[PDB]
Every structure is written in C-alpha cells, then in structure tokens.
Amino acid sequence: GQCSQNEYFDSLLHACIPCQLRCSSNTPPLTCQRYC
Amino acid sequence: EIVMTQSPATLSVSPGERATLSCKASQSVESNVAWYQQKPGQSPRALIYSASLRFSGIPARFSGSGSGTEFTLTISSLQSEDFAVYYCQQYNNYPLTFGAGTKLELKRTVAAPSVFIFPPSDEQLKSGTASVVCLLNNFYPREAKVQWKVDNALQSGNSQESVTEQDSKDSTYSLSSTLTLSKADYEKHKVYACEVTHQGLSSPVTKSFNRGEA
Numbered sequence: 348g349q350c351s352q353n354e355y356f357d358s359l360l361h362a363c364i365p366c367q368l369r370c371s372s373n374t375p376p377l378t379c380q381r382y383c
Numbered sequence: 384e385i386v387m388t389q390s391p392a393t394l395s396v397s398p399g400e401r402a403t404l405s406c407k408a409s410q411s412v413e414s415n416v417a418w419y420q421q422k423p424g425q426s427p428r429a430l431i432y433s434a435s436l437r438f439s440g441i442p443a444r445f446s447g448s449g450s451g452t453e454f455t456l457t458i459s460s461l462q463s464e465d466f467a468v469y470y471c472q473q474y475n476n477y478p479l480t481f482g483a484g485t486k487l488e489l490k491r492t493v494a495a496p497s498v499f500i501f502p503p504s505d506e507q508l509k510s511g512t513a514s515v516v517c518l519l520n521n522f523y524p525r526e527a528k529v530q531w532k533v534d535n536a537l538q539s540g541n542s543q544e545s546v547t548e549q550d551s552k553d554s555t556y557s558l559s560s561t562l563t564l565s566k567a568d569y570e571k572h573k574v575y576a577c578e579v580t581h582q583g584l585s586s587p588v589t590k591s592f593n594r595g596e597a
C-alpha cells in the first residue's frame with residue numbers, strides 16, 4: 348500500500364494503521380522506527 | 384508454506400486465573416500475527432491483529448504480545464465466556480496459515496460418573512445389527528477408561544466412543560461407548576458388561592445385562 352510515513356500497512360485488514368498504536372509496544376513495526 | 388505451532392493443545396484453568404498461550408512460527412513473520420476465538424458451532428472471532436492490537440469490542444482481558452517468530456496471547460482473568468478454541472494466524476507471507484489451536488478447559492472439582500448400559504432394541508435386531516451402548520453421564524476430569532466384557536471376556540477394537548463438550552452449567556462431560564456387533568455374533572454370547580474406571584470412583588463400576596434379562 349501507499350500509506351503515509353506516519354502509518355504502516357496491515358495486510359490482514361488491508362488498511363493503513365497509524366504507527367502511534369504500536370509505538371508503545373515492545374517492538375513497533377520495522378517501518379515505524381521514526382514516528383516513535 | 385509457514386508453520387504456526389501452538390502449545391499447549393489443551394489447558395485446564397479455572398475461572399479467575401490466567402492463561403498464557405504459545406504460538407511459534409517456522410519463519411520470521413515480523414509483527415503480522417492475529418489471534419482468533421472459536422466456540423463449537425460458531426465461526427471464528429477475531430481477537431488481535433498486528434501481534435498486540437485488539438479488534439473492536441475485545442476486552443482488555445485479552446493481551447497479545449511477541450514479534451519475529453515467538454508469539455503469545457495472555458488472558459488476564461478468565462471468565463466462563465472465554466473458554467473455547469484459540470488459534471493464532473500469520474499473514475506476513477502468503478498463503479495465510481493458522482495453528483492447530485489451543486483448547487481452554489474449565490477446571491472444576493472431581494465428579495464421578497453415573498454409568499448405564501443399553502441392550503440393542505428388537506427393532507435393530509431385525510435389521511441385522513446389534514449396538515450395545517454404555518453411557519457415562521456427568522463426570523470430571525475427562526480422562527476415563529471404559530472397557531467391555533462379553534461373557535466376562537475383555538474385548539479390544541470393537542467399540543467406538545464420543546464425548547460431549549463441557550456442560551454450560553455443570554462443566555462436566557458425558558461419554559458414550561458403543562459396541563457394534565452383528566446379530567449373529569451378538570447371539571453367541573449372553574452376559575454383556577461395561578467396566579468404568581475414573582478418578583471419582585474408588586474402584587471401577589460395572590454394569591451388565593444378560594441377553595433376555597427383561
């Protein structure tokens with residue numbers, strides 16, 4: 348997908364998920380290493 | 384394909400306690416793992432996506448964790464509503480793949496079974512088949528040994544059995560063991576017994592009937 352740098356694509360829901368949701372996780376997505 | 388390995392396949396936890404499920408993948412799937420709940424008859428129910436994010440309406444009870452190749456689902460304080468089969472899924476690589484599933488059993492106190500035996504009916508004998516059913520009603524834990532004795536001789540390989548899900552209120556099991564003989568073979572013997580072994584019984588319980596007892 349063509350999401351914004353402030354998001355990452357989840358292929359289960361086929362949508363752009365804001366990186367903020369997983370920023371406070373033990374390991375945010377490898378493409379969300381900036382927003383946090 | 385990728386393999387999702389869930390452990391344990393079963394888990395006996397009483398309401399109010401915690402359950403921790405394990406899901407291990409054969410390849411790294413980053414954080415692209417979901418969890419599902421499925422109850423008998425019902426279709427699956429999405430719980431978690433992206434390893435730790437819950438779907439709409441999923442209580443904080445359920446908490447997903449992990450990343451890479453080892454994943455976990457933790458249920459903080461079990462309620463009766465939560466006992467079911469739990470699957471993990473990876474969607475990092477196509478095709479999407481599920482695991483064998485973990486079955487949450489409801490732990491309760493020991494309950495001994497009530498045993499009953501049913502001779503074959505006269506209607507089934509005309510057809511040419513004889514089915515001898517032995518019923519175990521209301522018991523816990525599941526583990527139970529039910530042996531058949533024809534003319535006080537121990538049988539082997541001629542009986543199938545099926546069990547019910549835990550009761551909605553009792554949380555107990557009910558098991559049936561059906562001995563399938565032919566009318567010809569069923570009349571070569573007279574005494575048909577059913578021996579039951581369970582933790583709730585200090586010694587095995589045996590119920591029998593003689594061909595023509597009634």
Ligand SMILES: *[C@@H]1O[C@H](CO)[C@@H](O[C@@H]2O[C@H](CO)[C@@H](O)[C@H](O)[C@H]2NC(C)=O)[C@H](O)[C@H]1NC(C)=O
Nearest residue numbers: 348349350351355356357358360361362363364
């Ligand atoms: C199927 O749908 C996709 C996604 O909407 C279409 O791709 C879009 O195409 C339009 C016009 O070309 C663009 O404005 C969008 O930005 C495109 N989306 C993406 C993600 O590239 C696609 O054209 C459709 N396919 C058809 C009509 O055959």
Ligand SMILES: [Cu+2]
Nearest residue numbers: 520521556557
């Ligand atoms: Cu019953």
